[PDB]
Design a protein around this motif. Structure first.
Motif, mmCIF file in Angstrom:
data_model
loop_
_atom_site.group_PDB
_atom_site.id
_atom_site.type_symbol
_atom_site.label_atom_id
_atom_site.label_comp_id
_atom_site.label_asym_id
_atom_site.label_seq_id
_atom_site.Cartn_x
_atom_site.Cartn_y
_atom_site.Cartn_z
ATOM 1 N N UNK A 106 -1.621 -0.242 -2.939
ATOM 2 C CA UNK A 106 -0.811 -0.843 -1.971
ATOM 3 C C UNK A 106 0.064 0.140 -1.274
ATOM 4 N N UNK A 107 0.221 -0.101 0.003
ATOM 5 C CA UNK A 107 1.353 0.386 0.740
ATOM 6 C C UNK A 107 2.508 -0.522 0.432
ATOM 7 N N UNK A 108 3.596 -0.465 1.222
ATOM 8 C CA UNK A 108 4.784 -1.240 1.021
ATOM 9 C C UNK A 108 5.833 -0.621 1.868
ATOM 10 N N UNK A 109 6.738 -1.463 2.403
ATOM 11 C CA UNK A 109 7.630 -1.102 3.466
ATOM 12 C C UNK A 109 9.011 -1.467 3.092
ATOM 13 N N UNK A 110 9.961 -1.059 3.944
ATOM 14 C CA UNK A 110 11.366 -1.283 3.832
ATOM 15 C C UNK A 110 11.797 -1.703 5.179
ATOM 16 N N UNK A 122 6.311 6.887 1.201
ATOM 17 C CA UNK A 122 5.285 5.895 1.402
ATOM 18 C C UNK A 122 5.329 5.165 0.100
ATOM 19 N N UNK A 123 5.320 3.824 0.191
ATOM 20 C CA UNK A 123 5.722 2.961 -0.883
ATOM 21 C C UNK A 123 4.597 2.084 -1.313
ATOM 22 N N UNK A 163 7.913 10.896 -2.787
ATOM 23 C CA UNK A 163 7.024 10.024 -3.481
ATOM 24 C C UNK A 163 5.999 11.030 -3.883
ATOM 25 N N UNK A 164 5.820 11.311 -5.206
ATOM 26 C CA UNK A 164 4.804 12.258 -5.651
ATOM 27 C C UNK A 164 3.530 11.485 -5.415
ATOM 28 N N UNK A 165 3.623 10.166 -5.773
ATOM 29 C CA UNK A 165 2.816 9.009 -5.453
ATOM 30 C C UNK A 165 2.133 9.193 -4.155
ATOM 31 N N UNK A 166 2.916 9.161 -3.070
ATOM 32 C CA UNK A 166 2.451 9.595 -1.807
ATOM 33 C C UNK A 166 1.383 8.707 -1.249
ATOM 34 N N UNK A 221 -1.489 6.898 -1.814
ATOM 35 C CA UNK A 221 -1.910 5.551 -2.156
ATOM 36 C C UNK A 221 -1.091 4.458 -1.551
ATOM 37 N N UNK A 222 0.104 4.876 -1.186
ATOM 38 C CA UNK A 222 1.166 4.074 -0.753
ATOM 39 C C UNK A 222 1.216 3.944 0.740
#
Lengths: 167, 467, 509, 466, 128
Positions: free
Chosen positions: C143-147, C157-158, C371-374, C376-377
């Motif tokens: 998933x992405x995800x926003x603010x 990127x979340x 976001x180490x995540x980065x 995928x988000x």
């Protein structure tokens, strides 16, 4: 919560907190003397080694300390509930403390509320009365062989230094 | 219930009552203590004993001494009768002008409003000191922190503040002089007397005074804080008002809380500070707010512990602060009274969303510019002047004018100022600064703007200085 | 001998032979009370981890079952009680009532209202003690995800599940930062589906009621509040209450997750919790440790946070996205909990607060924000502009580095600074200004395609709005498409550009 | 023997056995706790009461309740079939592919192996990470303490090493997820699966995974160290293997310990520590070995608590190290990967014999220049660099270049970086730095040097930069 | 044993730093309180006494000697550190070595400025 009996002596905590319990226990029902006495009897009946310091081994555990001192109230014949509080000192190791706990308890009858004299006094003995040092006056003024190695020699001391103490 | 001194280790008086141990906080009165010996129950220590704190100084006591529990916490006079009167913690007239006739008593603990009572959006408390208001537009009910160089007429300002709003807008004020020098409260006292804000002919001197100077138990001094709160609560809810709670020093309180903790056998956290430093804070601060009935706008004098504020407590305190008064000795040194630090005395609430967007812009623009001038001083300092643009010059002058325009004459201190103070209706204020900013006067002396009241009057002063 | 109760009424009947007896098995009498820690004699047959209930109806937790008493931490006040008091078990550990009709509700941590809409519509209770899921249950966040804070969503990127630190000092509207984040989700909640929605749990820790009052009000106004729990243990709150609130939240977010839902818990703010908890420990005399903090506060947070995850489908796909808050003292982060949280969290959003204060809104320390995540988000769309942008900003920052000289460099770099400034304006997004994504990438796109580099920075923003209103009107179409494609199309781009040019042309030049 | 819950004061479960006491560390099974609730005997408290630690949660548990001693400490299944299965501390799936079957057990304490048994020589293994190799190249069987980063770097680094290694070395591995962040291991799992190193059609991966997540009680986390340690000893000796012991992060263990000592009502130590902080560690480390029946090379993630190493605990740790990678977050902040404290990134066996002298000397030179430079920034900062002899200015620059050249970007984090993945054979490396040392290159920019594999590519990049 | 048996003995204590750690631990475990840095202080006495057991004797004792080369390994050169302070107060010098030199390749890597035996400079060698 409960009635809290703080009869003169009273250990002011310090492990006659049981005593204070038992001052209210004793006081309830007024098995005061009975138990007071129970305790005397018990007192050395325990406090000797005789099964008792053996039982005061650590190494015997309340596996069955709960089953032989306790069952020394059983082993004895006291315990109108006076063992049960034992069984508490039992865990609470207060068994080794007890004489004093008894002391505090007792002292004896009206003796419960004693007193021994001091400052300039030589004299040993309790006070059971109301107002006092009537009796003490009449206690000294009893014998006259008497000691001063039973307390105060006002002599070396009281004023023996004082003139010195001025110079 | 009567209890017995079982232990006195300092003002920790451990009392054994073989009689009820009510809830904690209960003020106990020692039987045999001919001056009011409040013990506040601190612990029910267990086994019929409570831990108390004497809120007073101990002596003569015997172990066993009889104490009779007041059956409640400390209750104190609440009501108007405190206004123009000095009570101590216990409430007792340290005005030393006989008693104060109250009937309404309150236990000094109180609580944070429960949530629904929250007047959800605070609204500017109008300082009316143009500059002040401008840069720190306070919130009604707000916590204002006062960082500041002492006795500048710190007090004068405060006095003045009380004057400015609490008179103007008929609010009320509390000064709880916590831990203060008796001397300083004394000084102040007369100073109010002198100011007439304290009237001795009226106990509707816009301030009720409570003092709990450095000679009481820390907690006791600390609790003078609650006391003040309790009173102010009276005036808010009961008097429906904006009570101003002037506090000096919330720090000293803080220290005091911590002080008991140790002795309370606690482990009082960071800096030695009470672990409950926060809770203490929270609960009191949370008592402060704007109820629907009114506001307790808390103006809290802030001593700079370790000349620092990251001292966890002040740091925390910031959370509670919302408007900051940084007083500027520099501004004072420029003779400018107001002497406030402008660009640091701020209010978070400052928004355009909030507190008018215009106001806001004007303010931000101002702040910006004030800073910009601030920059330019630095430049000019080294670069003389008119090595630079006249727009800078213009602004400099404007800034300066504005600066001067911030200077607001003062109203009882005709003795210092040779002027009389003045109060400024907000809009014209906003307008005011904008106008100067708009440089619409550019032929008037700036010295005019010095010690001006409302902008019209500034125009007026402009005229007179413009001959 | 000296434990206690040896001069209580405990012994006092035990003398006699324990005479008259009830519980001390399931109820206990407050042996001593102080510190909100009710040493309670008895309760003896109590659970482990029981929530208890006081005679004053207050709660406690029987943490420590000592051989003699239960040290019961009290979720309340002993100015409201006194010694010997009956503590009655609830029998049960801590659970919280859980329910989703709490969405549209502000509760206290006990799960009772503070919304004052009477009782909760909750009917469930659910362990606050609930466990963190397993490895396998968790599954990666595609998933992405926003603010709605473009800048955030972009450069952070979340995804949903994600533990992400909100970190910065002092109310910048620190909370504001959070607020906008929430507001944006409204549209998603005005959008569809549980996973195309996020349920907000704003666990407000230590946040004075006043903070809440406004805030909630804000939420009300936005009434995104409808899909929202605000678990609130404000400043006032008894420490165990304050402490408890996240855990409470912990039950609830996992719930949602477990009700497939993709939930968002904003743990706001664990700093305050930690303080309390440590305090709590210390009040228990239970230690501190490092930095005055006892060390299982890490565990705390792990315990808390591990329960936040993105699951696979066997696990409802669930998510609980955790947005913890830490407000720094001064970027003081050896500060144990920051240390912790960084390692726990799956990135952290550092704000360079001064800048904010300098006016920057947003004011991010992007450099540190991570976001180490980065990957995928994020959406390809975003990837296309933003990917580049971050990078480009990498250079901008790099060249913002060497501002001693100025832009008397080469044009590229002179530009990078200019461009950079521009990008800043674009990344500045007002507060109370959340946007939907396609517009965002769009708005970024122009500048990153360098178009706006004619402009003086102020007009970027200005453009942006104006541009926005333009597309809003017209190219609303295009937004439809971009929204559809999740990528920016050649066309869309071209059109975008074209729009841009028109817009630009419309804008001034 | 069976015990009575007598007190549960936290997860210190005080158990009273009304029967014999077994030794300490005997694992007790809480009865009624099907969910294998080991309490570990910790103390004989006296009067057949033990202090135990629950490693699993404690709720519902009344005092009184019944705990049964397994008659031994925690023994867990051990065996190769784990190689590609994830066991939790209690030697049980968290692969959750049902349970793995092993038929060998171990109590999770192995003991310090006698000295004589050692492979008393360990010899340069390499990582392909220039910097690493340069400063601190691997050896063979050694425990490296890896300090620092998050997995912005640290965790990344470990992984990267892994990336080359299991594959490249036939590296038999243990992965010990210590106080693990479950998530990463989850991710990892799939990766491992993906990577096929975890091959599931043959649970003979290069690696057995043990994850001992944060979420477990301290006790659980504390004990997993012993466990993992046990496994690897099995795998080394028993399974003959070239073990790698991945520990992430031993610090979190340490942390568990400290809490525990405290909780044990016992004195911890300074900073909250433990008195025995060392001895547990020491003894653990001493259980670790490369005897001659294989190797346990430890790759030890050691989270520098609060990033302070000064911190006696890490201070201690060092004793057990024999090669270290000490990062520099300081460097890291500068973007850098790999970002090191160079002046303690080691292999103790840094020697011109051991490493070739070319390496060595170069290294000594490097360490020198960089250090000198290290002196100099401070100066530069307090000045400019201008006053400072330009040659030095050059070296300074070079030093950064060297830095930049040390910067090595990775494949897995091309993903992140947008920037190619690289590994560098040593000689090209020696050469690399040596060339920069020869300073001919000098004219070329830092950024050419930044994030490369061979310097050659950097040379390429420089031109390309130009 | 040697010393007094005339011989000249060399003890290298590597390292008392660790020793103190143990001891202290041991103490603490005895509940016997710490001291500074959690170290109780008669580890000094201990060691002092230990080191007092090192000596150079006369002939009656075979000229006996035991030379002690204690090692204390600094942690970030923290002389300050209790035990270092201790030892400092005990010593007949200390040889401070700096890492930096080592890094220079400078090996020996001595911090000579700090390295001292004052006393040693008569127990030497005319040549030298």
């Amino acid at each position: 919560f409960a009635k809290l009996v703080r009869p003169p002596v009273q250990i002011y905590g310090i492990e006659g907190r049981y005593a204070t319990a038992l001052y209210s226990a004793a006081s309830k029902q007024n098995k005061l003397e009975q138990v007071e006495k129970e305790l005397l009897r018990v007192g050395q009946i325990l406090k000797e080694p005789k099964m008792a310091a053996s039982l005061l081994n650590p190494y015997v555990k309340r596996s069955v300390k709960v089953k032989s001192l306790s069952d020394m109230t059983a082993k004895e014949k006291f315990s109108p509930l006076t063992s049960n509080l034992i069984n508490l000192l039992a865990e609470n190791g207060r068994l080794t403390n007890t004489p004093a706990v008894i002391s505090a308890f007792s002292t004896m009858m009206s003796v419960h509320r004693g007193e021994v004299p001091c400052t300039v006094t030589t004299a040993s003995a309790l006070d059971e009365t109301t107002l006092t040092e009537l009796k003490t006056v009449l206690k000294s003024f009893l014998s006259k062989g008497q000691v001063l190695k039973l307390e105060v020699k006002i002599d070396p001391s009281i004023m023996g230094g004082m003139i010195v103490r001025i110079g | 219930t009567t209890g017995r001194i079982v232990a006195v280790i300092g003002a920790v008086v451990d009392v054994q009552f073989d009689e009820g141990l009510p809830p904690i906080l209960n003020a106990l009165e020692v039987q045999g203590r001919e001056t009011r010996l409040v013990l506040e129950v601190a612990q029910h220590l267990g086994e019929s004993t409570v831990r108390t704190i004497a809120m007073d100084g101990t002596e003569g006591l015997v172990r066993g001494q009889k104490v009779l529990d007041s059956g409640a916490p400390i209750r104190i006079p609440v009501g108007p009768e405190t206004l123009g009167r000095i009570m101590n913690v216990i409430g007792e007239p340290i005005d030393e002008r006989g008693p104060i006739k109250t009937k309404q008593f309150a236990a000094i603990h109180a609580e944070a409003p429960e949530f629904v009572e929250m007047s959800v959006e605070q609204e500017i408390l109008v300082t009316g000191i143009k500059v002040v208001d401008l840069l720190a537009p306070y919130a009604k009910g707000g916590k204002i922190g006062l960082f500041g160089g002492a006795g500048v007429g710190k007090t004068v300002l405060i006095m003045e503040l009380i004057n400015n709003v609490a008179k103007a807008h008929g609010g009320y004020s509390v000064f709880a002089g916590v831990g203060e020098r008796t001397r300083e409260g004394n000084d102040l006292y007369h100073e109010m007397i002198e100011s007439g804000v304290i009237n001795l002919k009226d106990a509707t001197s816009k301030v009720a005074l409570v003092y709990g100077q450095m000679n009481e138990p820390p907690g006791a001094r600390a609790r003078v804080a609650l006391t003040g709160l309790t009173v102010a609560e009276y005036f808010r809810d009961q008097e429906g008002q904006d009570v101003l709670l002037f506090i000096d020093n919330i720090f000293r309180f803080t220290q005091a809380g911590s002080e008991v903790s140790a002795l309370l056998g606690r482990i009082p956290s960071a800096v030695g500070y009470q672990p409950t430093l926060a809770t203490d804070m929270g609960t009191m601060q949370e008592r402060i707010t704007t109820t629907k009935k009114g506001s307790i706008t808390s103006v809290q004098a802030i001593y700079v512990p370790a000349d620092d504020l990251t001292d966890p407590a002040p740091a925390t305190t910031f959370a509670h602060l919302d408007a900051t008064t940084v007083l500027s000795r520099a501004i004072a040194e420029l003779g400018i009274y107001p002497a406030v630090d402008p660009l640091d005395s701020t209010s978070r609430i400052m928004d355009p969303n909030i507190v008018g967007s215009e106001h806001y812009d004007v303010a931000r623009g101002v702040q910006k510019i004030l800073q910009d001038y601030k920059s330019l001083q630095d430049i000019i300092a080294i670069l003389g002047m008119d090595e630079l643009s006249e727009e800078d010059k213009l602004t400099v002058s404007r800034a300066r004018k504005i600066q001067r325009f911030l200077s607001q004459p003062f109203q009882v201190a005709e003795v210092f100022t040779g002027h009389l103070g003045k109060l400024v209706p907000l809009k014209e204020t906003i307008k005011g600064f904008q106008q100067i900013l708009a440089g619409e006067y550019d032929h008037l002396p700036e010295q005019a703007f010095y010690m001006v009241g409302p902008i019209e009057e500034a125009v007026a002063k402009a005229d007179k200085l413009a001959e | 001998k000296t434990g206690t109760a040896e001069v209580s009424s405990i012994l006092e009947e035990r003398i006699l032979g324990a005479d008259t007896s009830v519980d001390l098995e399931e109820t206990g009498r407050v042996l001593s009370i102080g510190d909100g820690i009710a040493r309670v004699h008895g309760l003896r047959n109590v659970q482990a981890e029981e929530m208890v209930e006081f005679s004053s109806g207050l709660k406690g937790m029987s943490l420590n079952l000592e051989p003699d008493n239960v040290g019961v931490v009290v979720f309340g006040n002993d100015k409201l009680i006194k010694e010997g008091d009956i503590v009655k078990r609830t029998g049960a550990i801590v659970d919280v009532p859980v329910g989703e009709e709490l969405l549209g509700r502000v509760v206290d941590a006990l799960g009772n209202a503070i919304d004052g809409k009477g009782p909760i519509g909750s009917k469930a209770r659910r362990r606050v003690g609930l466990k963190a899921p397993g490895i396998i249950p968790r599954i990666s966040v595609r998933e992405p995800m926003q603010t709605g804070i473009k800048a955030v969503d972009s450069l952070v990127p979340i995804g949903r599940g994600q533990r992400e630190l909100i970190i910065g000092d002092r109310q910048t509207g620190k909370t504001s930062i959070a607020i906008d984040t929430i507001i944006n989700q409204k549209r998603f909640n005005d959008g569809t589906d549980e996973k195309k929605k996020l349920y907000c749990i704003y666990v407000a820790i230590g946040q004075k009621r006043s903070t809440v009052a406004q805030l909630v009000k804000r939420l009300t106004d936005a009434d995104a509040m409808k899909y929202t729990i605000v678990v609130s243990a404000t400043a006032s709150d008894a420490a165990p209450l304050q402490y408890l609130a996240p855990y409470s939240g912990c039950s609830m977010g996992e719930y949602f997750r477990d009700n497939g839902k993709h939930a968002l818990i904003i743990y706001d703010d664990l700093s305050k919790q930690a303080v309390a908890y440590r305090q709590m420990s210390l009040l228990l005399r239970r230690p501190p440790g490092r930095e005055a903090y006892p060390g299982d506060v890490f565990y705390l947070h792990s315990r808390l946070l591990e329960r936040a995850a993105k699951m696979n489908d066997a696990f409802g796909g669930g998510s609980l996205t955790a947005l913890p808050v830490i407000e720094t003292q001064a970027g003081d982060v050896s500060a144990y909990i920051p240390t912790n949280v960084i390692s726990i969290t799956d990135g952290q959003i550092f704000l360079e607060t001064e800048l904010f204060y300098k006016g920057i809104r947003p004011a991010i320390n992007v450099g540190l924000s991570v976001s180490r995540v980065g990957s995928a988000a994020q959406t390809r769309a975003m990837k296309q502009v933003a990917g580049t942008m971050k990078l480009e900003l990498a250079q901008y920052r790099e060249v913002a580095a060497f501002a001693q000289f100025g832009s008397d460099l080469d044009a590229a770099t002179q530009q990078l600074l200019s461009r950079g400034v521009r990008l800043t304006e674009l990344l500045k997004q007002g507060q109370y200004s959340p946007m939907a994504i396609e517009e965002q990438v769009a708005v970024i796109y122009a500048g990153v395609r360098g178009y706006l580099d004619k402009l003086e920075p102020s007009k970027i923003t200005k453009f942006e709005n104006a541009f926005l209103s333009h597309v809003i009107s017209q190219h609303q179409a295009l937004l439809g498409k971009i929204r559809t494609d999740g990528k920016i199309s050649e066309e869309s781009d071209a059109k975008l550009k074209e729009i841009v040019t028109n817009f630009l042309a419309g804008f001034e030049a």
